[PDB]
Amino acid sequence: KQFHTGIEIKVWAIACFAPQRQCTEVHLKSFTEQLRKISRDAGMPIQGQPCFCKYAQGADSVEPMFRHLKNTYAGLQLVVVILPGKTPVYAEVKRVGDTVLGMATQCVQMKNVQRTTPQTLSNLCLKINVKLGGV
Ligand SMILES: Nc1ncnc2c1ncn2[C@@H]1O[C@H](COP(=O)(O)OP(=O)(O)OP(=O)(O)O)[C@@H](O)[C@H]1O
Numbered sequence: 001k002q003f004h005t006g007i008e009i010k011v012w013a014i015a016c017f018a019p020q021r022q023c024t025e026v027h028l029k030s031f032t033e034q035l036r037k038i039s040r041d042a043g044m045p046i047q048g049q050p051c052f053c054k055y056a057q058g059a060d061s062v063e064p065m066f067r068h069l070k071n072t073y074a075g076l077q078l079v080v081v082i083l084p085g086k087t088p089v090y091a092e093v094k095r096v097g098d099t100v101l102g103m104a105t106q107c108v109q110m111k112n113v114q115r116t117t118p119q120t121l122s123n124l125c126l127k128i129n130v131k132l133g134g135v
Helices: 025-041 059-072 089-101 110-114 118-132
Strands: 012-016 052-055 078-083 105-109
Touching: 012 025, 012 059, 025 110, 025 118, 052 059, 059 089, 078 089, 078 110, 078 118, 089 105, 105 110, 105 118
Parallel strands: 012 052, 012 078, 078 105
Antiparallel strands: none
16 A cells, blocks of 8 residues: 555553563653654654553453543554464454544564564554545
């Protein structure tokens, strides 16, 4: 697909389903700041401060959390969801956002939050662009 211009992501949340002890708050902060700079540079600025950033465990936590987000944050544009490898959490996130609450979500692997590369950040930006782009 081609790149879309005129996306700005102002209202967004992080849900971290990776354990804190593996993916710590400095990991999250760091990853978010790198994401902030590459997306800005590509013309699709995601604001550096998510409206929400919490850790959760289990697919059972997903639906309560997302209903929480929907009910708390007007204008919420995106949930970025951090996953510890392979996990039923992925399917549940997609179930709830895609088919129940109509919430855009973008999943990301814990290893790519612990240690970012330009290429994986780009991959993410490109996926975000497609989702929030309107074409
Ligand atoms: N079964 C799974 N368990 C854990 N993580 C997964 C699983 N399937 C995919 N992922 C992770 O989700 C990330 C991308 O999720 P994303 O939100 O982009 O899905 P999607 O946009 O619905 O995919 P598609 O573009 O094919 O529809 C990838 O980095 C991948 O590692």
